[PDB]
Design a protein around this ligand. Sequence first.
Ligand SMILES: Nc1nc2c(ncn2[C@@H]2O[C@H](COP(=O)(O)OP(=O)(O)OP(O)(O)=S)[C@@H](O)[C@H]2O)c(=O)[nH]1
Ligand SMILES: [Mg+2]
Length: 166
Amino acid sequence: YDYLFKVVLIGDSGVGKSNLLSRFTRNEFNLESKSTIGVEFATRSIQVDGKTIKAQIWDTAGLERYRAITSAYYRGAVGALLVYDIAKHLTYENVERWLKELRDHADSNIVIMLVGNKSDLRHLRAVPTDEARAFAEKNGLSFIETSALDSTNVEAAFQTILTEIY
Ligand SMILES: Nc1nc2c(ncn2[C@@H]2O[C@H](COP(=O)(O)OP(=O)(O)OP(O)(O)=S)[C@@H](O)[C@H]2O)c(=O)[nH]1
Ligand SMILES: [Mg+2]
């Protein structure tokens, strides 16, 4: 590989962080929900401008009740996929709290991509696309809606963030 980019997954529990990771790295998806244990790592390489970019994606549980995420989790990360569930407005409301967590524990120039996941539940949508997109605008973040289930935009989300990082 030519470059190794550490990118982390963050967002409320249940939003789809883990399946987003499995879909991108192993083209797999599981409907059985299992809260993530400790910190998980997955890798994948892609081509960007003729070069080979090794993407190292970090994943962890969204709940920080008894054990909160440290700067070590974020350390050296050049990218962050901040995820929420379009069907659960609460997970969208909490994005502000995650941005504060990034501000306090991650490099000030990290590339942050807001990800509205569970696109396939468009009929149960609680967070209008235009509103989220505008929000991403005002906060200087990239934005994209995905579906780890039907696979919509998953590759595009990761591909885009890595390219932005390049
Ligand atoms: N309909 C739909 N369900 C999805 C999608 N992505 C994940 N899910 C479902 O949501 C549930 C939680 O997904 P998961 O990937 O475990 O969440 P998480 O953010 O990693 O959760 P945690 O480790 O912080 S607790 C699962 O039952 C999974 O199958 C998606 O695009 N569409
Ligand atoms: Mg998980």
